[PDB]
Ligand binder design. Structure first.
Ligand SMILES: Nc1ncnc2c1ncn2[C@@H]1O[C@H](COP(=O)(O)OP(=O)(O)OP(=O)(O)O)[C@@H](O)[C@H]1O
Ligand SMILES: Nc1ncnc2c1ncn2[C@@H]1O[C@H](COP(=O)(O)OP(=O)(O)O)[C@@H](O)[C@H]1O
Ligand SMILES: [Mg+2]
Lengths: 896, 440
């Protein structure tokens, strides 16, 4: 009702657009006011949902007014339009609309600036005056323009200050990262062109090396914002030094010119009166325009040669307004390359995770959303789309390309004429050669320019990243890391889930980032990170291979967490053996940095027993409450898991995972701020179900819904995968998640027996009965009985480890049932009775799924390995042991 | 006999079916366009020129050889038939034996097959008997029917050929790809509007809306002079209805087998330095597309170089020649960009990147005396010519080129034995199919 009153019930001259909807809204408002008055002194929700249908065209026109509303849900659109005086509602959707802005800084009914996701503060040139008369779209448009102008102004100020002759180390403390980055790039390309006019490169190379050393020294004593900015400028300056050193080592002038032409150059027009079109970016003879959209301080990428060639081919495709296309195996730098190209072009690339649910209407609506905005659209995993949709949207994509190339003002898609911004572009990052993925038609493939990135450059990435972290020996350490990864990939068992590519190296570096405080930036840190990342995903012999090669190539307390685990297991009745504690160590260490985890082993090996007790112990250790949403993936349908588009009225219905993500994002009651959220997928890892979460699981950490909604993944929102086999899983969903392989059962046979026992007793004198039952149990003969049970023929083959449950529940239930007659007999008779009951329970739990002759053999062997003897027809009546022949009643059936 | 052969072809592949109405329309065209032999010869020429476009390259060669065999066996004597059959058998590796010497073309075929030039031996029948060929434009311009179906394998599309044909015919194409109900409704409305008003219409990927194709398209083709319809399907896709296919003209679009033919096609599809760079790019594209089909030896996989790569490389060449007006053309930059960005983006294996880099170094070496092929040399343009003069000079030096019989090895700079194996296998397949076809 607040949203309805905001859109229609409060604003004037807004009820004259839809008079029938105006009358319906007035009637609903009167009914709600009457209900509220009655309460203060079902049907309403149904009426509201009925009048939502007439609001769809109004919402579509509102999205047409401000094109960035296409990335918002209908409820979010209602909230943002309705809140016309509070003005703090709009700041919540800044990340959904822009991507790099988390909120808006407000000061006395005015807009001072915006704040980036990482915490960077950008101050606007002119404070926007906000009044109750104005509504969202106008001041949002002028805020977008003001942000672009502020970015340009800070760029110009930083560039002028650097041209004055001052060093960058004093300028990085003044302006935003984007301004420093672009001004430094312009200065670098100007100075390199000046040096290339001559034939001297050593002087500028030495100057750049001194700048890099000064930045590295300044990084050690700066704040977190300044540290991130210095790290990103250090990435850019290392790229500068690499290019200058490559130019210096060049033999002749022509090859130096070719090398300079192959790399991005950041020029600036000195005669254009338009401020935002004053900077153009050059590579391979082509020119692209800087947009001056806010970027913030993103995780900058290392400038590998593959990255530069990908930038060159993206520029080659975009020069003719064609689409950019990246293909290759998983974890090779396609989506991140596109995002880095966008960041270098001064705009946030909007990434879409394609899926089977994206039909022609959904994909075309996303296309009209991104063409009206002018944003750069990346369609991640374009193969996952159905082939029919791929053929259908080819016309729309070709129309977008033709309109961009011919400068058409409007393009007609989805039976409507909408404006086409000239700043838009389309990118696709597909993964050919994978099962469960369709093949793009050639008429669609000719609309994109495809580039292959099968093999990245892990050595350069590792070297530059380790150098930025502050490592004294970086080249040798990076070479050792890459060589160790290669030997681990080559000299291990060739089973499908062993991938040692770029993603695991990035995970090793990210895990080596935070323990340098107490291990030190050396070799112990990197070997510990390598262990913590790779060892959980290795088997039994491959673990020994890991140890051997680690000792070959690399020469070189956690008491509280162990205590917390032990306390949690004691509360849960588990036994802390070496294997269980090792698995819990591995899970805790690999969940400390990796947010998505897969647990793989045999059925009943102890995956749930591991993650439950680790979660409990972390709740003890950190004091944070834990919420767990265990979802069986394949029980539900994909439309029932993520959501479905109702074709009756083109409205969105949430799934289960989407509902949980929206509930944790909304934070209505404020109890999810300081809690860890676990979503466990306890089913088979279907590529169709799971690969729809590709953008969720990687560094994007976003859920791209069909209706354009972009739900972020909070840092405390973690996803667990529980399964047995990775036979059908693709490497795309394997590399993204830290994998914890269960080589064997984490529990001994007797420890599992004891856990089932005391769990049954807790589910229920009693201590005497428990002690007598345990004394009846004899592990020395129990192990031999279990070993001899393996020789029997079993239908529906169940491991003997899994059959202890049925035996324990049968024994405990029999004792509880017969406890009524357990106070009028001697200790020996009681022991014999309990022994017979446990023997029949073991019989019908171990050999109960076998033939009668096998059951006779098993009762014979359980008699020889045990005590009251139990026969094939032994029984207890009401408490004397007898047989079946005295229990049969006389039956004389009638004729009918 | 020809109708039985075409029925056998339609038995082999669903797209190759033949209707009696189409054959009788061809027979009528024979008269629309020693006498009885002349009508028979014109019948053979017309049936080849019309129903060759509906077959791919191997079936083209098979049908050309079997029509040549039929005509020449009926006309000539039994010794000629025995000689031709022995040459086919030694091409099929079934009956190894020298032919009995008599005429003149017989020794030409014998020289082609003894020098292990299997491609020339296969195309000798086409070069000797038939003296005309049809492309998509000829099929459209010589058809009373207004409905057309074009088929090609996956990872190749002939939509750009139809767009070029519509541009040359001053018509309008409404490209409506199929696969969704909105596209189907738009196609229905556009079909009605184009029937009433005029204009062409192309449906793309019709094998993907098979229910709509089986009902609406079947009923519509079952029942304006400037209205034409085109539909694209895949040869490896799901089977299309026979009644719909038999009522439409069928075309198989496939890349030109020749090297010099591809150069001439790309040259005719288009200051002096721009023309020179276009000539060099066309030669490079033809050479790389010729080397592409050699799966294990020329490259490491099967690649697909199409008109988009040619367009992008030509645009890059024009931009380089536009921003470098000091006549110091960065030939190394052009080589690196064409080998790495334009034509190298699809290349996934590093050794194939090396061979395409070698090809670019050979083609775009930037030398005054460039020898792109062992026979033809391309001198650099002077500074006192014109664009038309350069166009004419390059066309003239293209016309004097004669492609040899061993051009799949010498022109591509490849070992001879791999070409021997490839040509031998292809000729064995073609001749075995023709032998299995002729005896019945
Ligand atoms: N450390 C332990 N101490 C005692 N019992 C244990 C321990 N670990 C596992 N178990 C026993 O193992 C049984 C099966 O383990 P768990 O419930 O973790 O299976 P799971 O990994 O979820 O298997 P599945 O994939 O078949 O569902 C539990 O019921 C429990 O009794
Ligand atoms: N210079 C770089 N190039 C590519 N990836 C990099 C680079 N530096 C770091 N990375 C990391 O490597 C990972 C590669 O992921 P990526 O291959 O882009 O995903 P996708 O498989 O969807 O293309 C990213 O998470 C990124 O953080
Ligand atoms: Mg991706």
């Amino acid at each position: 009702w607040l949203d309805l009153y905001g859109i229609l019930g409060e604003n004037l001259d807004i009820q004259n657009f839809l008079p029938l909807e105006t009358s319906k809204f007035k009637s609903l408002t009167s009914e709600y006011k009457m209900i509220t008055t009655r309460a203060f002194q079902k049907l309403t929700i149904d009426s509201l949902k009925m009048i939502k249908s007439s609001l769809s065209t109004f919402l579509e026109r509102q999205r047409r007014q401000f094109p960035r509303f296409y990335f918002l849900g209908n409820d979010d659109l209602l909230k943002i339009i309705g809140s016309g005086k509070h003005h703090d509602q709009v700041s919540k959707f800044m990340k959904k609309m822009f991507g790099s802005i988390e909120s808006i800084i407000f000061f006395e009914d005015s807009i001072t600036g915006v704040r980036s996701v990482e915490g960077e503060v950008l101050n606007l040139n002119e404070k926007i005056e906000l009044k109750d008369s104005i509504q969202a779209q106008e001041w949002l448009n002028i805020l977008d323009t003001e942000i672009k102008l502020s970015v340009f102004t800070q760029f110009r100020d930083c560039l002028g200050q650097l041209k004055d002759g001052t060093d960058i180390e004093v300028v990085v403390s003044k302006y935003i990262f984007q301004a420093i980055l672009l001004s430094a790039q312009v200065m670098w390309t100007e100075l390199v062109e000046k040096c290339l006019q001559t034939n001297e490169f050593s002087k500028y190379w030495k100057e750049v090396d001194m700048k890099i050393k000064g930045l590295l020294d300044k990084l050690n004593k700066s704040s977190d914002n300044v540290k991130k900015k210095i790290e990103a400028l250090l990435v850019e300056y290392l790229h500068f030094n690499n290019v200058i050193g490559q130019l210096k080592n060049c033999s002749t002038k022509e090859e130096a010119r070719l090398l300079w032409a192959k790399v991005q150059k950041f020029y600036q027009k000195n005669d254009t009166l338009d401020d935002l079109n004053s900077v153009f970016i050059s590579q391979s003879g082509y020119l692209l325009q800087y947009k001056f959209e806010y970027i913030g301080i993103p995780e900058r990428l290392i400038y590998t040669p593959l990255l530069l060639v990908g930038f060159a081919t993206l520029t080659d495709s975009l020069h003719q307004k064609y689409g950019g296309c990246f293909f290759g195996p998983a974890g090779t730098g396609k989506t991140e390359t596109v995002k880095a190209f966008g960041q270098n072009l001064g705009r946030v690339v909007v990434v879409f995770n394609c899926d089977d649910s994206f039909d022609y209407q959904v994909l075309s609506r996303l296309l009209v959303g991104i063409t009206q905005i002018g944003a750069w659209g990346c369609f991640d995993e374009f193969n996952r789309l159905d082939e029919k949709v791929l053929s259908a949207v080819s016309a729309n994509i070709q129309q977008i390309q033709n309109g961009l190339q011919v400068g058409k003002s409007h393009i007609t898609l989805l039976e409507e004429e909408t404006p086409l911004s000239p700043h838009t572009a389309v990118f696709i990052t597909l993964n050919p050669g994978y099962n469960g993925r369709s093949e793009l038609p050639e008429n669609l493939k000719k609309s994109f320019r495809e580039f292959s990135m099968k093999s990245p450059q892990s050595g350069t990435i590792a070297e530059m990243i380790l150098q930025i972290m502050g490592f004294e020996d970086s080249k040798s350490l990076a070479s050792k890391i890459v060589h160790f990864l290669e030997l681990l990939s080559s000299k291990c068992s060739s089973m499908n889930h062993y991938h040692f590519g770029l993603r695991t190296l990035k995970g090793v570096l990210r895990n080596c980032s935070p323990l340098v405080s107490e291990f030190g930036e050396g070799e112990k840190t990197v070997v510990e990170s390598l262990k913590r990342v790779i060892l959980p995903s290795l088997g039994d012999t491959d673990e020994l291979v890991f140890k051997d090669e680690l000792s070959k190539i690399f020469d070189s307390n956690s008491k509280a967490i162990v205590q917390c685990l032990k306390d949690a297991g004691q509360r849960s009745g588990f036994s802390m053996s070496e294997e269980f504690l090792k698995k819990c160590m591995q899970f805790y260490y690999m969940q400390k940095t990796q947010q998505a985890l897969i647990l793989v082993g045999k059925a009943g090996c102890g995956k749930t027993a591991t993650w439950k007790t680790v979660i409990d112990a972390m709740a003890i250790f950190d004091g944070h409450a834990n919420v767990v949403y265990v979802i069986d993936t394949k029980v539900l349908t994909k439309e029932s898991l993520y959501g479905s588009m109702l074709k009756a009225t083109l409205e969105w219905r949430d799934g289960l995972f989407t509902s949980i993500l929206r509930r944790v994002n909304d934070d209505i009651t404020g109890t999810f701020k300081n809690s860890r959220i676990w979503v466990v997928f306890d089913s088979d890892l279907d590529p169709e179900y799971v690969e729809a979460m590709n953008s969720v699981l990687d560094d994007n950490k976003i859920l791209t819904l069909p209706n354009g909604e972009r739900l972020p993944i909070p840092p405390n929102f973690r996803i667990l995968f529980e399964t047995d086999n990775l036979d059908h899983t693709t490497p795309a969903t394997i590399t993204r998640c830290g994998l914890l392989w269960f080589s064997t059962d984490v529990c001994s046979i007797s420890s599992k027996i004891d856990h089932l026992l005391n769990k049954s007793y807790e589910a229920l004198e009693l201590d005497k009965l428990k002690d007598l039952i345990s004394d009846s149990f004899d592990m020395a003969s129990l192990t031999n009985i279990f070993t001899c049970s393996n020789d029997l023929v079993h239908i529906l083959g169940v491991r003997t480890f899994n059959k202890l449950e049925t035996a324990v529940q049968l024994a405990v239930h029999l004792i509880s049932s017969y406890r009524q007659w357990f106070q009028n007999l001697d200790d020996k008779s009681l022991k014999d009775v309990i022994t017979l009951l446990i023997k029949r329970s073991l019989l019908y739990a171990l050999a109960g799924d076998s033939t009668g002759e096998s059951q006779r053999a098993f009762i014979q062997t359980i008699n020889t390995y045990f005590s009251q003897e139990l026969s094939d027809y032994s029984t207890i009546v009401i408490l004397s042991f007898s047989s079946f022949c005295s229990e049969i009643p006389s039956v004389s059936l009638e004729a009918h | 006999k020809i109708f039985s052969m075409l029925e056998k072809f339609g038995q082999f592949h669903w797209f190759y079916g033949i209707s009696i109405g189409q054959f009788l329309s061809c027979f009528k065209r024979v008269f629309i366009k020693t006498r009885v032999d002349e009508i028979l010869w014109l019948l053979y020429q017309e049936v080849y020129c019309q129903f060759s476009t509906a077959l791919d390259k191997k079936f083209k060669m098979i049908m050309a050889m079997t029509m040549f065999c039929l005509y020449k066996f009926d006309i000539e004597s039994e010794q000629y038939k025995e000689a031709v059959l022995t040459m086919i058998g030694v091409l099929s590796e079934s009956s190894d034996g020298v032919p009995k010497l008599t005429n003149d073309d017989l020794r030409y075929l014998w020289d082609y097959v003894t020098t292990k030039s299997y491609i020339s031996a296969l195309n000798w029948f086409k070069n000797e008997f038939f003296v005309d060929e049809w492309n998509i434009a000829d099929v459209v311009a010589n058809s009373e029917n207004n409905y057309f179906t074009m088929a090609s394998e996956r990872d190749v599309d002939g939509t750009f050929k139809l767009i070029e044909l519509a541009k040359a015919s001053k018509e309008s194409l409404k490209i409506i790809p199929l696969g969704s109900i909105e596209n189907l409704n738009y196609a229905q409305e556009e079909i009605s509007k184009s029937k009433i008003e005029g204009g062409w219409i192309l449906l793309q990927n019709i094998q993907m809306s098979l229910s709509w194709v089986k009902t609406y398209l079947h009923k519509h083709v079952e029942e304006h002079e400037k209205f034409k319809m085109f539909m694209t399907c895949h040869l490896t896709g799901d089977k299309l209805p026979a009644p719909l296919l038999q009522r439409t003209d069928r075309v198989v679009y496939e890349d030109i087998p020749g090297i010099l033919d591809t150069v001439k096609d790309l040259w005719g599809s288009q200051g002096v330095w721009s023309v020179y760079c276009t000539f060099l790019l066309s030669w490079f594209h033809a050479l790389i597309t010729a080397r592409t089909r050699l799966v294990p030896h020329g490259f490491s996989k099967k690649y697909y170089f199409n008109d988009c790569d040619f367009q992008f490389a030509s645009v890059y060449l024009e931009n380089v020649l536009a921003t470098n007006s000091t006549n110091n053309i960065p030939w190394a930059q052009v080589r690196d960009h064409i080998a790495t960005i334009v034509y190298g983006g699809k290349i996934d294996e590093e050794k194939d990147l090396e061979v395409v880099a070698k090809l670019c170094a050979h083609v775009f070496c930037g030398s005054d005396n460039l020898q792109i092929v062992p026979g033809v040399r391309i001198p650099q343009p002077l500074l006192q010519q014109s664009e038309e003069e350069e166009r004419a000079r390059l066309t003239a030096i293209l016309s004097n080129t004669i492609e040899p019989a061993d051009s799949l090895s010498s022109w591509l700079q490849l070992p001879r034995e791999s070409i021997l194996d490839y040509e031998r296998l292809q000729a064995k397949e073609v001749a075995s199919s023709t032998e299995q076809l002729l005896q019945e």
